[PDB]
Protein backbone atom coordinates (compact mmCIF):
# COMPACT_ATOMS: atom_id res chain seq x y z
CA UNK A 1 0.00 0.00 0.00
CA UNK A 2 3.00 2.24 0.65
CA UNK A 3 4.35 4.27 -2.27
CA UNK A 4 8.01 3.23 -2.60
CA UNK A 5 9.99 4.89 -5.41
CA UNK A 6 12.62 2.24 -6.14
CA UNK A 7 14.16 4.41 -8.88
CA UNK A 8 15.64 6.88 -6.39
CA UNK A 9 17.14 3.99 -4.41
CA UNK A 10 18.85 2.70 -7.55
CA UNK A 11 20.02 6.20 -8.47
CA UNK A 12 21.31 6.72 -4.93
CA UNK A 13 23.22 3.42 -4.97
CA UNK A 14 24.79 4.34 -8.31
CA UNK A 15 25.68 7.79 -6.96
CA UNK A 16 27.53 6.30 -3.98
CA UNK A 17 29.55 3.92 -6.18
CA UNK A 18 30.59 6.66 -8.62
CA UNK A 19 31.61 8.96 -5.73
CA UNK A 20 32.88 6.54 -3.07
CA UNK A 21 36.50 7.24 -4.05
CA UNK A 22 36.24 10.91 -5.08
CA UNK A 23 38.38 12.86 -2.62
CA UNK A 24 36.80 16.03 -1.25
CA UNK A 25 39.03 18.90 -2.37
CA UNK A 26 38.88 22.56 -1.32
CA UNK A 27 36.10 23.57 -3.74
CA UNK A 28 34.43 20.16 -4.17
CA UNK A 29 30.64 20.43 -4.25
CA UNK A 30 27.72 18.07 -4.83
CA UNK A 31 26.62 18.14 -8.47
CA UNK A 32 23.11 19.02 -9.60
CA UNK A 33 22.41 15.39 -10.54
CA UNK A 34 23.53 14.17 -7.12
CA UNK A 35 21.65 16.94 -5.30
CA UNK A 36 18.44 16.07 -7.15
CA UNK A 37 19.00 12.43 -6.18
CA UNK A 38 19.58 13.33 -2.51
CA UNK A 39 16.58 15.67 -2.75
CA UNK A 40 14.41 12.83 -4.08
CA UNK A 41 15.61 10.16 -1.62
CA UNK A 42 14.53 12.24 1.38
CA UNK A 43 11.20 13.23 -0.20
CA UNK A 44 10.49 9.63 -1.22
CA UNK A 45 11.41 8.53 2.31
CA UNK A 46 8.70 10.77 3.76
CA UNK A 47 5.96 9.73 1.31
CA UNK A 48 6.36 6.02 2.14
CA UNK A 49 4.79 6.56 5.59
CA UNK A 50 3.46 10.13 5.36
CA UNK A 51 1.19 10.27 8.41
CA UNK A 52 1.18 8.92 11.94
CA UNK A 53 -1.22 6.21 13.03
CA UNK A 54 -4.32 7.59 14.73
CA UNK A 55 -3.66 5.47 17.84
CA UNK A 56 -0.04 6.68 18.19
CA UNK A 57 -0.09 10.42 17.49
CA UNK A 58 1.88 13.37 18.82
CA UNK A 59 -0.36 15.77 20.80
CA UNK A 60 2.24 18.45 20.02
CA UNK A 61 1.82 17.90 16.27
CA UNK A 62 5.46 16.92 15.77
CA UNK A 63 6.03 14.72 12.69
CA UNK A 64 6.97 11.65 14.73
CA UNK A 65 6.50 9.42 11.66
CA UNK A 66 9.88 10.62 10.32
CA UNK A 67 11.69 10.97 13.67
CA UNK A 68 11.07 7.75 15.65
CA UNK A 69 12.23 4.18 15.11
CA UNK A 70 8.66 2.85 15.42
CA UNK A 71 7.65 4.50 12.13
CA UNK A 72 11.02 4.46 10.34
CA UNK A 73 11.53 0.72 10.83
CA UNK A 74 8.18 -0.04 9.15
CA UNK A 75 8.80 2.62 6.48
CA UNK A 76 8.93 0.51 3.31
CA UNK A 77 11.26 2.98 1.57
CA UNK A 78 13.68 2.84 4.51
CA UNK A 79 13.39 -0.96 4.56
CA UNK A 80 14.01 -1.31 0.82
CA UNK A 81 16.85 1.22 0.94
CA UNK A 82 18.85 -0.43 3.73
CA UNK A 83 18.44 -3.87 2.09
CA UNK A 84 19.10 -2.83 -1.52
CA UNK A 85 21.88 -4.78 -3.28
CA UNK A 86 22.39 -7.30 -0.46
CA UNK A 87 22.50 -4.34 1.93
CA UNK A 88 25.78 -3.09 0.46
CA UNK A 89 24.93 0.55 1.24
CA UNK A 90 24.20 -0.44 4.84
CA UNK A 91 27.57 -2.19 5.03
CA UNK A 92 29.38 0.93 3.80
CA UNK A 93 27.33 3.15 6.12
CA UNK A 94 28.14 1.18 9.28
CA UNK A 95 31.84 2.00 8.80
CA UNK A 96 31.41 5.79 8.61
CA UNK A 97 31.41 8.54 11.22
CA UNK A 98 31.79 12.32 11.20
CA UNK A 99 35.51 12.35 12.03
CA UNK A 100 36.75 9.92 9.35
CA UNK A 101 34.84 11.15 6.28
CA UNK A 102 37.16 12.18 3.44
CA UNK A 103 35.38 11.28 0.16
CA UNK A 104 32.15 12.44 -1.46
CA UNK A 105 30.53 9.01 -1.29
CA UNK A 106 31.22 8.79 2.44
CA UNK A 107 29.91 12.32 3.00
CA UNK A 108 26.65 11.76 1.11
CA UNK A 109 25.96 8.24 2.38
CA UNK A 110 26.53 9.02 6.06
CA UNK A 111 24.49 12.24 6.18
CA UNK A 112 21.55 10.86 4.19
CA UNK A 113 21.39 7.47 5.92
CA UNK A 114 21.35 9.20 9.31
CA UNK A 115 18.36 11.27 8.19
CA UNK A 116 16.32 8.39 6.73
CA UNK A 117 17.13 6.31 9.83
CA UNK A 118 16.31 9.04 12.36
CA UNK A 119 19.76 8.79 13.97
CA UNK A 120 21.94 11.58 15.29
CA UNK A 121 25.66 11.60 14.57
CA UNK A 122 26.32 10.21 18.07
CA UNK A 123 24.07 7.20 17.39
CA UNK A 124 21.13 8.38 19.49
CA UNK A 125 17.71 8.56 17.79
CA UNK A 126 15.98 11.85 17.09
CA UNK A 127 12.97 10.93 19.25
CA UNK A 128 12.50 7.84 21.41
CA UNK A 129 9.49 5.67 20.64
CA UNK A 130 8.17 6.34 24.15
CA UNK A 131 8.08 10.07 23.32
CA UNK A 132 5.75 9.78 20.31
CA UNK A 133 2.69 10.68 22.40
CA UNK A 134 4.66 12.98 24.73
CA UNK A 135 3.01 16.19 25.92
CA UNK A 136 6.31 17.75 27.11
CA UNK A 137 6.61 20.52 24.53
CA UNK A 138 9.91 21.96 25.80
CA UNK A 139 11.61 18.56 26.09
CA UNK A 140 10.52 17.38 22.63
CA UNK A 141 11.50 20.74 21.12
CA UNK A 142 15.04 20.42 22.51
CA UNK A 143 15.49 16.98 20.94
CA UNK A 144 14.23 18.11 17.53
CA UNK A 145 16.35 21.27 17.78
CA UNK A 146 19.41 19.15 18.59
CA UNK A 147 18.84 16.86 15.60
CA UNK A 148 18.24 19.76 13.21
CA UNK A 149 21.25 21.70 14.50
CA UNK A 150 23.63 18.73 14.54
CA UNK A 151 23.04 17.89 10.86
CA UNK A 152 24.37 21.31 9.89
CA UNK A 153 26.98 21.46 12.66
CA UNK A 154 28.32 18.02 11.77
CA UNK A 155 28.89 19.00 8.15
CA UNK A 156 30.69 22.16 9.31
CA UNK A 157 33.00 19.96 11.39
CA UNK A 158 33.78 18.02 8.20
CA UNK A 159 34.26 21.22 6.19
CA UNK A 160 36.70 22.62 8.77
CA UNK A 161 38.88 19.49 8.87
CA UNK A 162 38.89 18.94 5.10
CA UNK A 163 38.90 22.72 4.42
CA UNK A 164 36.03 22.29 1.97
CA UNK A 165 33.97 25.24 0.79
CA UNK A 166 30.79 24.03 -0.94
CA UNK A 167 29.72 20.56 0.28
CA UNK A 168 26.15 20.98 1.51
CA UNK A 169 23.21 18.80 2.52
CA UNK A 170 20.37 20.58 4.27
CA UNK A 171 18.14 19.70 7.18
CA UNK A 172 14.75 18.70 5.72
CA UNK A 173 11.81 20.93 6.55
CA UNK A 174 10.15 18.55 9.02
CA UNK A 175 13.16 18.67 11.37
CA UNK A 176 12.47 22.38 11.96
CA UNK A 177 9.47 21.68 14.21
CA UNK A 178 9.39 24.65 16.64
CA UNK A 179 13.07 25.22 15.81
CA UNK A 180 14.28 28.83 15.82
CA UNK A 181 16.50 29.33 12.78
CA UNK A 182 17.92 32.54 14.23
CA UNK A 183 18.90 30.53 17.31
CA UNK A 184 20.55 27.76 15.27
CA UNK A 185 22.54 30.40 13.37
CA UNK A 186 23.93 32.04 16.51
CA UNK A 187 24.33 28.79 18.47
CA UNK A 188 26.67 27.25 15.90
CA UNK A 189 28.70 30.29 14.87
CA UNK A 190 29.18 31.65 18.40
CA UNK A 191 30.79 28.33 19.36
CA UNK A 192 33.37 27.71 16.60
CA UNK A 193 35.35 30.57 15.06
CA UNK A 194 36.63 28.24 12.33
CA UNK A 195 33.20 28.11 10.69
CA UNK A 196 33.43 31.87 10.04
CA UNK A 197 36.30 31.28 7.60
CA UNK A 198 35.62 32.69 4.14
CA UNK A 199 36.58 29.38 2.47
CA UNK A 200 34.74 27.02 4.84
CA UNK A 201 31.14 25.86 4.47
CA UNK A 202 29.80 28.61 2.24
CA UNK A 203 26.60 26.89 1.10
CA UNK A 204 26.07 25.84 4.72
CA UNK A 205 26.40 29.52 5.66
CA UNK A 206 24.09 30.73 2.88
CA UNK A 207 21.50 28.16 3.98
CA UNK A 208 21.63 29.11 7.66
CA UNK A 209 21.92 32.87 7.15
CA UNK A 210 18.81 32.98 4.96
CA UNK A 211 16.82 31.02 7.56
CA UNK A 212 18.16 33.31 10.30
CA UNK A 213 16.52 36.40 8.76
CA UNK A 214 13.33 34.78 7.40
CA UNK A 215 11.18 32.75 9.76
CA UNK A 216 9.19 29.67 8.84
CA UNK A 217 5.78 31.29 9.45
CA UNK A 218 5.62 34.94 8.39
CA UNK A 219 1.81 35.18 8.84
CA UNK A 220 0.55 38.46 7.30
CA UNK A 221 3.96 39.21 5.72
CA UNK A 222 4.07 35.92 3.79
CA UNK A 223 4.12 36.13 -0.01
CA UNK A 224 4.64 32.43 -0.81
CA UNK A 225 3.71 29.21 0.98
CA UNK A 226 5.14 25.78 0.21
CA UNK A 227 3.39 22.65 1.48
CA UNK A 228 4.50 19.04 1.08
CA UNK A 229 2.92 16.13 2.98
CA UNK A 230 1.42 18.65 5.40
CA UNK A 231 4.76 20.34 6.13
CA UNK A 232 4.37 24.04 5.33
CA UNK A 233 6.81 26.93 4.98
CA UNK A 234 6.42 30.60 4.05
CA UNK A 235 8.65 33.09 2.24
CA UNK A 236 8.61 36.83 1.57
CA UNK A 237 11.84 37.13 -0.46
CA UNK A 238 13.27 35.22 -3.40
CA UNK A 239 13.88 31.57 -2.59
CA UNK A 240 17.37 30.47 -3.73
CA UNK A 241 17.94 26.90 -4.86
CA UNK A 242 19.98 26.00 -1.77
CA UNK A 243 16.90 26.82 0.33
CA UNK A 244 14.46 24.61 -1.58
CA UNK A 245 17.10 21.89 -1.96
CA UNK A 246 18.14 22.11 1.69
CA UNK A 247 14.62 22.08 3.12
CA UNK A 248 13.51 19.41 0.64
CA UNK A 249 10.77 21.35 -1.17
CA UNK A 250 9.87 21.00 -4.85
CA UNK A 251 8.46 23.56 -7.26
CA UNK A 252 5.87 20.88 -8.10
CA UNK A 253 4.48 20.93 -4.55
CA UNK A 254 1.65 23.17 -3.31
CA UNK A 255 2.84 26.72 -3.99
CA UNK A 256 0.41 29.42 -2.85
CA UNK A 257 0.73 33.14 -3.57
CA UNK A 258 -0.71 35.82 -1.28
CA UNK A 259 0.13 38.84 -3.45
CA UNK A 260 0.13 39.97 -7.07
CA UNK A 261 3.93 40.00 -7.17
CA UNK A 262 5.54 38.26 -10.13
CA UNK A 263 7.63 35.15 -9.45
CA UNK A 264 9.90 33.22 -11.81
CA UNK A 265 9.75 29.50 -11.02
CA UNK A 266 12.89 27.89 -12.44
CA UNK A 267 12.23 24.21 -13.11
CA UNK A 268 14.90 22.92 -15.48
CA UNK A 269 18.09 23.62 -17.40
CA UNK A 270 18.22 24.16 -21.16
CA UNK A 271 20.77 23.37 -23.86
CA UNK A 272 22.08 26.97 -23.88
CA UNK A 273 23.56 26.92 -20.34
CA UNK A 274 20.41 28.62 -19.09
CA UNK A 275 17.25 27.93 -17.11
CA UNK A 276 13.63 27.49 -18.16
CA UNK A 277 11.13 29.10 -15.80
CA UNK A 278 7.39 29.63 -15.40
CA UNK A 279 5.98 33.01 -14.36
CA UNK A 280 3.05 33.53 -12.00
CA UNK A 281 1.24 36.77 -11.15
CA UNK A 282 -2.18 36.22 -9.59
CA UNK A 283 -2.96 35.19 -6.04
CA UNK A 284 -3.81 31.58 -5.34
CA UNK A 285 -2.34 28.20 -6.18
CA UNK A 286 0.62 28.37 -8.58
CA UNK A 287 0.56 24.99 -10.34
CA UNK A 288 3.49 24.03 -12.57
CA UNK A 289 1.98 21.96 -15.39
CA UNK A 290 5.30 21.14 -17.06
CA UNK A 291 6.81 17.66 -17.02
CA UNK A 292 8.97 16.86 -14.01
CA UNK A 293 12.59 16.87 -15.24
CA UNK A 294 15.06 14.10 -14.56
CA UNK A 295 17.88 14.35 -12.01
CA UNK A 296 20.27 15.84 -14.58
CA UNK A 297 18.17 18.93 -15.32
CA UNK A 298 15.71 19.48 -12.46
CA UNK A 299 15.83 22.87 -10.71
CA UNK A 300 13.97 24.20 -7.66
CA UNK A 301 14.32 27.97 -7.29
CA UNK A 302 12.10 31.06 -7.27
CA UNK A 303 13.02 34.67 -8.04
CA UNK A 304 10.61 37.17 -6.49
CA UNK A 305 10.04 40.59 -8.06
CA UNK A 306 8.80 42.97 -5.36
CA UNK A 307 8.36 46.74 -5.71
CA UNK A 308 6.97 47.97 -2.39
CA UNK A 309 17.86 41.16 0.34
CA UNK A 310 17.16 41.60 -3.36
CA UNK A 311 20.45 39.80 -4.07
CA UNK A 312 18.76 36.53 -3.07
CA UNK A 313 16.99 36.76 -6.42
CA UNK A 314 20.11 37.49 -8.47
CA UNK A 315 20.42 34.90 -11.21
CA UNK A 316 23.86 33.58 -10.26
CA UNK A 317 23.00 32.94 -6.59
CA UNK A 318 19.30 32.02 -6.73
CA UNK A 319 20.53 29.03 -8.77
CA UNK A 320 23.52 26.99 -7.60
CA UNK A 321 26.31 27.28 -10.15
CA UNK A 322 27.36 24.03 -11.80
CA UNK A 323 31.00 25.12 -11.58
CA UNK A 324 31.66 24.41 -7.90
CA UNK A 325 34.38 27.07 -7.67
CA UNK A 326 32.01 29.78 -8.98
CA UNK A 327 29.18 29.18 -6.48
CA UNK A 328 27.97 32.44 -4.92
CA UNK A 329 27.01 32.48 -1.25
CA UNK A 330 26.85 36.15 -0.23
CA UNK A 331 25.72 39.57 -1.40
CA UNK A 332 29.33 40.71 -1.79
CA UNK A 333 29.94 38.41 -4.79
CA UNK A 334 26.30 38.33 -5.96
CA UNK A 335 25.93 38.82 -9.73
CA UNK A 336 22.79 39.05 -11.86
CA UNK A 337 24.27 38.44 -15.32
CA UNK A 338 23.33 36.01 -18.06
CA UNK A 339 19.54 36.41 -18.32
CA UNK A 340 19.62 36.10 -22.13
CA UNK A 341 20.51 32.42 -21.64
CA UNK A 342 17.22 31.67 -19.83
CA UNK A 343 13.82 31.08 -21.40
CA UNK A 344 10.22 31.65 -20.34
CA UNK A 345 7.86 28.71 -20.83
CA UNK A 346 4.42 30.42 -20.72
Amino acid at each position, epitope marked *: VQDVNVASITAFKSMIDETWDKKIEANTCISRKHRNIIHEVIRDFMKAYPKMDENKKSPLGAPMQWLTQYYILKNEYHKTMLAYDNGSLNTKFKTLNIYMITNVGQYILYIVFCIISGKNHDGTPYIYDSEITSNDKNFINERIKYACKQILHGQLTIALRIRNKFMFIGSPMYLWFNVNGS*QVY*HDIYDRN*AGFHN*KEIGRLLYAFMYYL*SISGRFLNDFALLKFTYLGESWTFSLSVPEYILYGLGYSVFDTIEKFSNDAILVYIRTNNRNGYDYVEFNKKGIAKVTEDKPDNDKRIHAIRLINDSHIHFGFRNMVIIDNECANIQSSAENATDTGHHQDSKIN
Partner: antibody
Amino acid sequence: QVQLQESGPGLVKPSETLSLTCSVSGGSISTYYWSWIRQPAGKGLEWIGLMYNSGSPNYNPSLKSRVTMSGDTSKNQFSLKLSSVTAADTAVYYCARLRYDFWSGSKGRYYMDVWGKGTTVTVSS
Amino acid sequence: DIQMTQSPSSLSASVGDRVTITCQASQDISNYLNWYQQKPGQAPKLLIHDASNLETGVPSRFSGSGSGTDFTFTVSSLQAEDIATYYCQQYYNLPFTFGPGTKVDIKR
Protein backbone atom coordinates in the same frame (compact mmCIF):
# COMPACT_ATOMS: atom_id res chain seq x y z
CA GLN B 1 33.84 32.67 21.56
CA VAL B 2 32.81 36.19 20.56
CA GLN B 3 34.75 38.84 22.49
CA LEU B 4 34.89 42.61 22.02
CA GLN B 5 37.38 45.25 23.13
CA GLU B 6 37.09 49.02 22.71
CA SER B 7 40.08 51.25 22.00
CA GLY B 8 40.68 54.92 21.30
CA PRO B 9 42.09 58.21 22.57
CA GLY B 10 40.85 59.05 26.05
CA LEU B 11 40.97 62.80 25.39
CA VAL B 12 39.27 64.79 22.61
CA LYS B 13 39.20 68.57 22.28
CA PRO B 14 35.80 70.28 21.93
CA SER B 15 34.33 70.52 18.41
CA GLU B 16 36.83 67.88 17.27
CA THR B 17 36.10 64.30 16.19
CA LEU B 18 35.89 61.34 18.56
CA SER B 19 37.26 58.12 17.03
CA LEU B 20 36.87 54.67 18.60
CA THR B 21 37.53 51.14 17.38
CA CYS B 22 36.02 47.81 18.44
CA SER B 23 38.19 44.73 17.84
CA VAL B 24 36.28 41.45 17.46
CA SER B 25 37.73 38.00 18.14
CA GLY B 26 36.17 34.56 17.92
CA GLY B 27 34.12 35.34 14.81
CA SER B 28 33.78 37.58 11.77
CA ILE B 29 32.09 40.96 11.94
CA SER B 30 30.20 39.92 8.79
CA THR B 31 28.37 37.23 10.80
CA TYR B 32 26.44 39.33 13.35
CA TYR B 33 24.91 42.74 13.98
CA TRP B 34 26.72 45.24 16.19
CA SER B 35 25.96 48.38 18.19
CA TRP B 36 27.61 51.20 20.13
CA ILE B 37 26.34 52.19 23.58
CA ARG B 38 27.66 54.99 25.79
CA GLN B 39 27.03 55.85 29.43
CA PRO B 40 28.09 59.12 31.10
CA ALA B 41 29.49 58.94 34.61
CA GLY B 42 26.70 58.16 37.06
CA LYS B 43 24.00 58.32 34.37
CA GLY B 44 22.12 55.82 32.22
CA LEU B 45 22.73 54.14 28.88
CA GLU B 46 22.30 55.77 25.46
CA TRP B 47 22.14 53.67 22.30
CA ILE B 48 24.30 55.32 19.63
CA GLY B 49 23.69 53.18 16.56
CA LEU B 50 23.75 49.72 15.05
CA MET B 51 25.54 48.09 12.13
CA TYR B 52 24.22 45.12 10.18
CA ASN B 53 26.39 42.30 8.86
CA SER B 54 26.40 44.04 5.46
CA GLY B 55 27.99 47.11 7.07
CA SER B 56 24.86 49.23 6.63
CA PRO B 57 24.62 51.49 9.71
CA ASN B 58 21.57 52.93 11.48
CA TYR B 59 22.12 55.81 13.89
CA ASN B 60 20.23 57.34 16.78
CA PRO B 61 18.21 60.34 15.51
CA SER B 62 19.54 62.41 18.42
CA LEU B 63 23.07 62.09 16.98
CA LYS B 64 21.91 61.52 13.40
CA SER B 65 24.32 64.02 11.82
CA ARG B 66 27.46 63.68 13.96
CA VAL B 67 27.94 59.87 13.84
CA THR B 68 29.60 57.61 11.30
CA MET B 69 29.99 53.84 11.71
CA SER B 70 31.91 51.60 9.32
CA GLY B 71 33.39 48.11 9.26
CA ASP B 72 36.85 46.85 8.30
CA THR B 73 36.71 43.21 7.19
CA SER B 74 40.48 42.98 6.69
CA LYS B 75 41.13 43.86 10.35
CA ASN B 76 37.86 42.43 11.76
CA GLN B 77 37.10 45.77 13.40
CA PHE B 78 34.40 48.42 13.23
CA SER B 79 34.76 52.09 14.11
CA LEU B 80 32.78 54.93 15.65
CA LYS B 81 33.34 58.56 14.63
CA LEU B 82 31.62 61.43 16.42
CA SER B 83 32.17 64.97 15.12
CA SER B 84 31.73 68.36 16.81
CA VAL B 85 31.91 66.89 20.31
CA THR B 86 30.92 68.78 23.45
CA ALA B 87 30.98 67.93 27.17
CA ALA B 88 27.78 65.91 26.63
CA ASP B 89 29.93 63.32 24.82
CA THR B 90 32.17 62.61 27.83
CA ALA B 91 31.16 59.05 28.68
CA VAL B 92 32.22 55.42 28.79
CA TYR B 93 31.65 53.93 25.33
CA TYR B 94 30.74 50.26 24.81
CA CYS B 95 30.53 48.16 21.68
CA ALA B 96 28.29 45.11 21.77
CA ARG B 97 27.16 42.19 19.63
CA LEU B 98 23.49 42.56 18.67
CA ARG B 99 22.02 39.07 18.50
CA TYR B 100 18.87 39.05 16.37
CA ASP B 101 15.75 36.90 16.14
CA PHE B 102 13.33 36.81 13.19
CA TRP B 103 11.26 33.72 14.09
CA SER B 104 8.56 35.44 16.17
CA GLY B 105 7.24 38.07 13.76
CA SER B 106 8.63 40.12 10.89
CA LYS B 107 9.62 42.83 13.38
CA GLY B 108 13.11 41.73 14.35
CA ARG B 109 14.03 41.12 17.97
CA TYR B 110 17.44 42.48 18.97
CA TYR B 111 19.50 41.79 22.09
CA MET B 112 22.90 43.13 23.17
CA ASP B 113 24.27 39.98 24.80
CA VAL B 114 28.06 40.26 24.30
CA TRP B 115 29.59 43.51 25.57
CA GLY B 116 33.10 44.91 25.50
CA LYS B 117 34.92 46.22 28.55
CA GLY B 118 34.26 49.81 27.50
CA THR B 119 36.55 52.79 26.98
CA THR B 120 36.45 56.16 28.74
CA VAL B 121 36.53 59.32 26.60
CA THR B 122 36.68 62.84 28.06
CA VAL B 123 35.90 65.97 26.03
CA SER B 124 38.15 68.76 27.30
CA SER B 125 40.57 71.43 26.11
CA ASP C 1 11.12 58.09 20.52
CA ILE C 2 9.60 55.59 22.95
CA GLN C 3 10.39 56.65 26.52
CA MET C 4 11.01 54.19 29.36
CA THR C 5 10.39 54.70 33.08
CA GLN C 6 11.44 52.47 35.98
CA SER C 7 10.19 52.31 39.57
CA PRO C 8 11.56 52.57 42.16
CA SER C 9 14.70 54.61 41.39
CA SER C 10 16.40 52.61 44.15
CA LEU C 11 15.56 50.11 46.87
CA SER C 12 17.16 48.28 49.79
CA ALA C 13 16.29 44.68 50.62
CA SER C 14 17.70 41.92 52.81
CA VAL C 15 19.16 38.65 51.58
CA GLY C 16 16.29 36.30 50.80
CA ASP C 17 13.66 38.99 50.24
CA ARG C 18 11.49 39.04 47.13
CA VAL C 19 12.36 42.12 45.05
CA THR C 20 10.25 43.39 42.14
CA ILE C 21 11.10 46.15 39.65
CA THR C 22 8.62 47.75 37.25
CA CYS C 23 9.28 49.13 33.77
CA GLN C 24 6.77 51.19 31.78
CA ALA C 25 6.77 52.07 28.07
CA SER C 26 5.35 55.29 26.64
CA GLN C 27 3.49 53.21 24.03
CA ASP C 28 2.67 49.61 23.18
CA ILE C 29 5.88 47.65 22.57
CA SER C 30 4.40 44.11 22.84
CA ASN C 31 7.10 42.01 24.59
CA TYR C 32 10.06 43.66 22.81
CA LEU C 33 11.82 44.38 26.10
CA ASN C 34 15.21 43.43 27.55
CA TRP C 35 16.45 43.44 31.15
CA TYR C 36 20.09 44.26 31.93
CA GLN C 37 22.07 43.93 35.16
CA GLN C 38 25.07 46.24 35.52
CA LYS C 39 27.23 45.41 38.53
CA PRO C 40 29.55 48.19 39.74
CA GLY C 41 32.52 48.68 37.44
CA GLN C 42 31.21 46.35 34.72
CA ALA C 43 29.33 46.58 31.45
CA PRO C 44 25.58 45.86 31.42
CA LYS C 45 24.80 42.13 31.46
CA LEU C 46 21.71 40.93 29.60
CA LEU C 47 19.58 38.72 31.86
CA ILE C 48 16.14 38.49 30.22
CA HIS C 49 15.12 38.95 26.58
CA ASP C 50 11.63 39.23 25.10
CA ALA C 51 10.27 40.36 28.49
CA SER C 52 10.27 36.87 30.03
CA ASN C 53 12.95 34.62 28.46
CA LEU C 54 16.09 34.16 30.55
CA GLU C 55 19.52 34.20 28.97
CA THR C 56 21.59 31.03 29.11
CA GLY C 57 23.16 30.57 32.54
CA VAL C 58 21.12 33.22 34.37
CA PRO C 59 20.14 31.98 37.86
CA SER C 60 16.56 30.81 38.24
CA ARG C 61 15.89 33.40 40.96
CA PHE C 62 15.58 36.03 38.21
CA SER C 63 12.29 36.21 36.32
CA GLY C 64 10.39 38.73 34.23
CA SER C 65 6.93 39.20 32.78
CA GLY C 66 4.71 41.72 31.05
CA SER C 67 3.43 42.62 27.58
CA GLY C 68 2.26 45.90 26.10
CA THR C 69 3.39 48.90 28.16
CA ASP C 70 3.95 47.71 31.75
CA PHE C 71 6.62 45.15 32.62
CA THR C 72 7.84 43.45 35.80
CA PHE C 73 11.25 42.11 36.87
CA THR C 74 11.40 39.93 39.98
CA VAL C 75 14.26 38.46 42.02
CA SER C 76 12.65 35.67 44.03
CA SER C 77 15.44 35.30 46.62
CA LEU C 78 17.76 38.31 46.60
CA GLN C 79 21.45 37.47 46.97
CA ALA C 80 24.30 39.64 48.21
CA GLU C 81 26.08 39.46 44.83
CA ASP C 82 23.00 40.93 43.10
CA ILE C 83 23.94 44.51 44.07
CA ALA C 84 23.72 46.33 40.73
CA THR C 85 21.65 48.75 38.66
CA TYR C 86 18.93 47.05 36.61
CA TYR C 87 17.88 48.56 33.28
CA CYS C 88 15.02 47.79 30.91
CA GLN C 89 15.33 48.51 27.20
CA GLN C 90 12.90 48.38 24.29
CA TYR C 91 13.67 47.31 20.73
CA TYR C 92 10.18 47.74 19.28
CA ASN C 93 11.11 50.95 17.43
CA LEU C 94 14.36 52.61 16.52
CA PRO C 95 16.21 54.16 18.27
CA PHE C 96 16.68 51.58 21.03
CA THR C 97 15.98 53.31 24.35
CA PHE C 98 16.85 52.34 27.92
CA GLY C 99 15.10 53.07 31.18
CA PRO C 100 16.51 55.29 33.93
CA GLY C 101 17.54 52.19 35.89
CA THR C 102 16.80 50.83 39.36
CA LYS C 103 19.52 50.55 42.02
CA VAL C 104 19.19 47.40 44.13
CA ASP C 105 21.02 47.64 47.46
CA ILE C 106 21.51 44.92 50.08
CA LYS C 107 20.31 45.42 53.65
CA ARG C 108 22.48 43.72 56.28
